[PDB]
Subunit: 405 residues, 2 copies
């Protein structure tokens, strides 16, 4: 029942002259998941730009050791307000340094978000709608082009269902979305991003899980917009959804036969957030501590959540939002506390991802033609023999990979 997450490849071992390494004993092991187990990680920016020193840096590096032993995917911040507070002077270099550092850790990268009404550029409010739109399109061209080859996945536009009717504060993006409409805006931002990076994975993202989001997506697809993956947020501060609700959402959004990314996951290990709060940002409390029984609940619920999503074929990524407690809403939504205590949820998900869902080392022998069949979870593998180690991909297409001296 996790067959769709697994595969078989044949590798061929040859000498330099093409002759088979026959009856050769080898060891094969998984080194990476193809499935994207991600986490937002915004500390990478100040870290990779040498903003920390001494024991604060050691404490942060301690957390990175745990982080990279679990995740293979990272969401990076591109909020226009933060990325370009001064018009014409983007923070390109800072995030290049962050992406290049993360790239040496061998994690996939996504940038988030290119277009959003929250934390957008404040100076937009001085421009006409015509100019705002023109500038948003140029922002996309610029940033997608500059990070091509380095960040090739994007949340292009975010929370489009509420975007035009957002009333918490005036912003440029609500203005243009109200002016030209959700569908025209989405079409143009996707067009612009594709123009700048033919190989980019382009997401639309939203927290809205009711029929307004699936109707929007149906309208976009029928109007010629090409979406590479549907992003669904999963901030469950007010209580875990449960399996049944999760599966109703998965089935309904699966009708499009597009990859589904669970883009932003939260379960808290303290008291739940009151259920009547609509916009989560309105819940501003001074302190929100983690509790022991809350940590047990968080761990159990997180396992059930990850299992439910991994079990669904069209799901292709699960991204946790806050790795450390006291992030967004100062919530205990992390796997690690601020004083670097590893919470039960880390042990639970580490066991799930790096043990239960991990193919164990295999001792194999090549046949007369130097062929070795490998079965396991889709991802990256190594074959070892003669003290040499060689990487290969284990994917769906049963094409034989040749490996030489």
């Amino acid at each position: 029942c996790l067959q769709h997450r697994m595969g078989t490849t044949t590798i061929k071992l040859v000498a330099a002259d093409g002759s088979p390494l026959a009856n050769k004993e080898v060891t094969v092991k998984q080194t990476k998941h193809k499935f994207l187990f991600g986490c937002a990680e915004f500390t990478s920016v100040p870290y990779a730009n040498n903003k920390f020193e001494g024991k604060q840096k050691e404490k942060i590096e301690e957390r990175y050791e745990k982080f990279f032993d679990l995740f293979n995917f990272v969401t990076l911040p591109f909020y226009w307000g933060k990325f370009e507070p001064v018009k014409g002077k983007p923070d390109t270099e800072s995030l290049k340094n962050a992406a290049k550092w993360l790239q040496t850790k061998g994690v996939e990268l996504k940038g988030h978000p290119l277009c959003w009404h929250t934390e957008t550029a404040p100076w937009l409010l001085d421009m006409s709608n015509s100019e705002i739109f023109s500038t948003q399109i140029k922002r996309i061209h610029r940033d997608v082009t500059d990070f091509k080859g380095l960040i090739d996945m994007w949340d292009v536009i975010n929370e489009v269902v509420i975007m035009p009717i957002f009333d918490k504060y005036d912003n440029g993006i609500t203005r243009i979305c109200k002016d030209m409409g959700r569908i025209k805006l989405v079409r143009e931002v996707f067009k612009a991003a594709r123009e700048s990076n033919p190989n980019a994975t382009l997401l639309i993202n939203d927290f809205e899980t009711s029929e307004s989001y699936d109707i929007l997506i149906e309208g976009l697809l029928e109007s010629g917009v090409h979406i590479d993956a549907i992003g669904i947020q999963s901030h469950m501060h007010q209580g875990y959804w449960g399996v049944e609700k999760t599966q109703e959402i998965l089935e309904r959004f699966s009708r499009f036969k597009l990859p589904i990314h669970f883009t932003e996951n939260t379960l808290v290990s303290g008291h739940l957030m009151p259920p009547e709060i609509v916009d989560l940002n309105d819940y501003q409390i001074p302190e929100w501590p983690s509790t022991p029984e809350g940590e047990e609940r968080q761990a159990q619920e997180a396992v059930t959540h990850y299992k439910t999503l991994f079990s669904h074929p069209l799901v292709e990524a699960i991204t946790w939002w806050d790795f450390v407690d006291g992030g967004w809403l100062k919530a205990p939504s992390g796997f690690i506390t601020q004083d670097n205590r590893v919470k039960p949820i880390y042990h639970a998900l580490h066991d799930l991802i790096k043990n239960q869902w991990w193919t164990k080392p295999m001792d194999l022998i090549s046949d007369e033609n130097g062929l070795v069949n490998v079965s396991g979870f889709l991802g990256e593998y190594e074959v070892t023999f003669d003290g040499k180690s060689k990487s290969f991909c284990l994917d769906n297409n049963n094409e034989t990979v040749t490996i030489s001296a």
Copy 2:
């Protein structure tokens, strides 16, 4: 403030040879509204097919006198389950007789609904989705063609937001809508209806007033579907919306610059329906009496509702659902009781529509060229002189109408 509801025309009075009737004293009066003040009227079917006799018929005719003194628009029933309970044997003649009778009363007609998951054809459940769709399209061709020239306005498809996720019972329309999607289905039913009647007014209708309906409409329009009017239901058994909520809905649906029809209006003159009930059809209570204070509330709320809608330029029709108490849900939702007592709401809306919103007789004299300028509410008028009476339209286009012997 109701300028958009009014206009000016010049009429030219000429003898049979084209020579002007100069300095001719005439009387002009309004005979009809252009604005569609409608009411569903399903009794027309048994009435016009001679199903009533004696004093039941007299009692019904008594109500029709009041009905036609108020309304200029009628919604007729085309529920597929009722219209064609036996496959291949539609109830065409019955509704032809009803429409022809109503036509002699000079009221505009709309048929409702051509495609809907509720009270559809039960025998669809024996067919494949392919056949269901094929048959629904043929139903539309047939009925739109047969009633061309007689019924030229249609609720083509109804409650599309819930249609694919409707789970109260299995039906053929939910099946095909889930299969091919809301947008493809709507496109095809509108295409088919337009093919059968180029001059037809084609509505989509829904009770859903949240952003899921306006997002659906935006998707339809962007996918090339041409909608003549947006239908919004307004069944307020659980309490009048209020002006503020009504106006938020009007503004939001006005962005499409299409006519808006308020297709099904209900306010009750007894106790309100409990607010937590989602599906109104579930509220099946043995008795639901009208009260005096409830009738005062009903009248005042109905005036406020009609005023709010009439004041909004893009609104072009308001249709009450039940003219007589004890109709749908046996609710006191009518203007008249079952023992033919005229309720306050009738007197309130009659005064509003046929007095406050009615241009009073004008005594005018034509100039040397036989020209008479007429101002008033858009609609049909008569000019009278020499004991002769002549109809003309008062509309937006500044066109002089000539009137001869």
